[PDB]
Amino acid sequence: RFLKVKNWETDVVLTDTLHLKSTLETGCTEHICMGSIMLPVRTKDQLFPLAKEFLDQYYSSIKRFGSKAHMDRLEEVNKEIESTSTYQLKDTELIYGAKHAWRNASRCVGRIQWSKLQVFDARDCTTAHGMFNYICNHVKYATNKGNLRSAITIFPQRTDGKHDFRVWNSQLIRYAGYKQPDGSTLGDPANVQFTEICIQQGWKAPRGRFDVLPLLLQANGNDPELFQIPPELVLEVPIRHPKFDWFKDLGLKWYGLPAVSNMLLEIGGLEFSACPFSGWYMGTEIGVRDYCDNSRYNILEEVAKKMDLDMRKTSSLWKDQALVEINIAVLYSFQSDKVTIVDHHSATESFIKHMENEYRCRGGCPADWVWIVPPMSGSITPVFHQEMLNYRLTPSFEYQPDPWNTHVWKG
Amino acid sequence: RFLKVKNWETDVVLTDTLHLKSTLETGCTEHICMGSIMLPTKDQLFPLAKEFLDQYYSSIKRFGSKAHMDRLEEVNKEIESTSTYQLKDTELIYGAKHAWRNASRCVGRIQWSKLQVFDARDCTTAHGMFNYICNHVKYATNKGNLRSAITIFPQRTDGKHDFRVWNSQLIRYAGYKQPDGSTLGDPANVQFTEICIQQGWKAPRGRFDVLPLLLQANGNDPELFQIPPELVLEVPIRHPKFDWFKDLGLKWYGLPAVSNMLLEIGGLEFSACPFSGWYMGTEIGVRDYCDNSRYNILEEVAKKMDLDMRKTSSLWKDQALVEINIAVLYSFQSDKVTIVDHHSATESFIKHMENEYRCRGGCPADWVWIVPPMSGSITPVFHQEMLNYRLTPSFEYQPDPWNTHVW
Ligand code: HEM
Ligand code: HEM
Ligand SMILES: CNCCCc1cncc(CCc2cc(C)cc(N)n2)c1
Ligand SMILES: C[C@H](O)[C@H](O)[C@H]1CNc2nc(N)[nH]c(=O)c2N1
Ligand SMILES: C[C@H](O)[C@H](O)[C@H]1CNc2nc(N)[nH]c(=O)c2N1
Ligand SMILES: [Zn+2]
Secondary structure (H helix, E strand, C coil): CCCCEEEECCCCEEHHHHHHHHHCCCCCCCCEECCCCCCCCHHHHHHHHHHHHHHHHHHCCCCCCCCCHHHHHCCCCHHHHHHCCCCCCCCCEEEEECCCHHCCCCCCHHHHHCCEEEEEEEECCHHHHHHHHHHHHHHHHHHHHCCCCCEEECCCCCCCCCCCEECCCCCCCCCCEEECCCCCCEECCCHHHHHHHCCCCCCCCCCCCCCCCEEEECCCCCEEEECCCCCCHHEEEEECCCCCCCCCHHCCEEECCCEEEEEEEEEEEEEEECEEECCCEHHHHHHHHHHHCCCCCCCCHHHHHHHHCCCCHHHHHHHHHHHHHHHHHHHHHHHEEEEEECCCHHHHHHHHHHHHHHHHHHCCCCHHHHHHHHCHHHCCHHHHHECCCCCCCCCEECCCCCCHHCCCCCC | EEEEEECCCCCCCCCCCCCHHHCCCCCCCCCCEECCCCCHHHHHHHHHHHHHHHHHHCCCCCCCCHHHHHHHHHHHHHHHHCCCCCCCCCHHHHHHHHHHCCCCCCCCCHHHCEEEECCCCCCCHHHHHHHHHHHHHHHHHHHHHHCCCEEECCCCCCCCCCEEEEEEEECCCHHHHHHHCEECCCHHHHHHHHHHHCCCCCCCCCCEECCCEEEEECCCCCCCCCHHHHCCCEEEEECCCHHHHHHHEEEEECCCCCCCCCCCCEEEEECEEEEEECCHHHHHHHHHHHCCCCCCHHHHHHHCCCCCCHHHHHHHHHHHHHHHHHHHHHHHHHHCCCCCCCCHHHHHHHHHHHHHHHCCCCCCCHHHHHHHCCHHCCHHHEEECCECCCCCCEEECCCHHHHHHCC
């Protein structure tokens, strides 16, 4: 089967054959598209085909398909599965797997960088303290004094599902949110629930607008433990605007390192429930979503006031106008401080090239248009005009339930 | 099977049951989502008629009535005898309004029940069609106070007598390829303009030439007509702050009127059914003016604002884009032509969705099309999960007549 996608701006037509290797579900049917839906203990039975599929890909990629090394390895994994009910990846396979999970991540516009990923093998980790050490080293390495480096740290895989390693933080670095008795919110409204958990676990909250949350770390299915990331390791950027001198007085800053820590990495049927990964920010993530979502810091009003825009009619586009200045300021600030960041024009343009490269060399590039298109100025970026096919390949990053909803407390 | 949609801004969750009445396919499968793809007999006819008449009679609280059964009986006889059937005026109006209600790509659907339906099923010639379309244009425009309307021409018979408006929209600007290798006017309209010229149009070769209508009646060869200039309302584009903007020589037409689509009601097919409402600003300011394959004016505007266009990271493109869109809205409002900004329109649509979920059990919506082409996430629709599915009556895409027409 052949599937064509078209770019309506360029008339470039690409042919996808890669989707034939698609395994998991989409959520869609012939009767319904769930393309805008956010979120739509394994037996040896199901496990060996998954291992085999993965090992065949790995051996093909190193051009050793059907080799004795390939066959011996299948044999070794088979025996290990029938003996121990699971298996261990070689370091090479782990690295290959992590890189490909990123490569297959259909919601990530940053994938041109997929082959450059520093993989930190933390499978020898046994305790929360050990996890803390590993994560500190990840943060320091990735931050690199502002010259950001993509990295992932991989903690031991799931066994019976009762001994899971989990990072309870959705991201390694995030600001606390505090609900006030008057209904108002101090800090990041997104993180109110998690902050409360942290407080309940014994965290002493400074109760400011930009308090870096402590790490809440679960090793081997045990109760999670609190650790504070050494502040000297947390790179932050004061936000200012190149022309507006009052912008600094808004009191804004953000952290430089975007680091997802709540996702599950699947490789060859194995499940890595704690696998924090990081890259560098695209400006709009902060300037559009973090700052301007009504459900987040929500600064559009204040900014628009200070720019003295006409705010009586939406039709003045005062919101749009303020939004631009805020995103200019985020980009300006990071650049001025020499902290890696990319604008949505650069990032989407790079993605189109990556995508075309992938069609040519790989036969496709699964992409989720709904996530790939930036949250401002959509149609003046080239991804907007690009038809995309969304499907799911393994290895992959997957959503998993929040640990506080599933954890069995030891006490 | 009973699907939930969440708004991530408000945490509001809606339950959709309406999708279990969908029938047409989406393009998607359990293995592949095609949500971003632009274009993915008596036997066949009677169940379609029945399904439609059932929903019609349910809508007037007369389900299972004798009049319901009588109509069903009558339609069935007519299909058996004549191979097709004729809609009653009431049914036609119901169907047209519901086609719009079911248009999952339309953000303006809160207005769906206020639609003026012009029954042009008595039309027989292209001159007839021309007259009906002029009257539509004049009625819809209403001196700037726009009114939603659709004009419905005779249904398809054997497929060899189709009525077609060859133009994709009732009102659009011509496109010309220059010796300069560049493009004059609207680049999207070059091929159609060629066909107009080849059919005998005398093109003025200007940048904003209103295209002539190319009208096909009864499967005959299409004929040319110029819409009376005085009925084509246009808006010169100026900026409220930038005095120089006027000098760009920009204007646009007040009437957005889609003419290339197929209206399906009760299995019947209306291949010629132009419909119109009123513009959302971004349609003109973002797409028409700033698309690289359209009027593509970003660079010039940016230069007149003297922005640093050295580096993409200055966001000069984004800045110019906002001002271009400010000017569009200002110009329409100043000239008193109905227009809606994307904030107001998406807000309306959220309330409509909630109404539709509350009173109909759902609302089919294509998020890819509903979210505006600028400032996506500062509009409520961005944070609104939507289910996309196909309900009938419906507007459907159809092939361009020049690839179809046996001359
Ligand atoms: C290096 C530069 C990178 C850039 C510019 C980038 C860009 C982005 C952006 C803008 C998003 C959307 C985030 C959101 O809307 O919440 C995203 C999502 C995602 N990225 Fe990347 N990313 C980068 C690196 C990485 C790396 C290193 C990985 C994994 C090894 C990765 C995997 C993912 C995944 C799995 C998602 C989906 C997250 C979710 O569903 O919440 N990215 N990326
Ligand atoms: C009166 C105010 C209206 C507003 C504000 C509005 C808004 C819009 C917008 C912004 C689009 C996207 C168009 C594009 O991006 O090219 C659209 C598409 C559409 N509209 Fe509405 N519309 C209105 C009236 C109507 C009416 C009266 C009908 C039918 C009787 C209709 C049916 C449709 C259909 C079928 C589409 C999809 C067109 C396509 O797929 O090319 N709309 N509308
Ligand atoms: C999933 N919706 C909520 C996301 C909230 C959130 C909070 N902090 C950091 C991120 C980072 C997202 C992200 C991750 C990576 C790896 C790179 C990049 N440029 N961006 C996301
Ligand atoms: C409902 C909708 O899917 C939701 O708002 C999505 C839209 N696209 C997105 N795109 C990105 N990059 N990040 C997001 O969080 C979202 N949210
Ligand atoms: C590839 C993508 O589907 C295409 O660019 C779509 C995206 N969303 C759109 N949305 C609207 N309203 N109108 C359009 O023409 C498009 N084009
Ligand atoms: Zn889909």
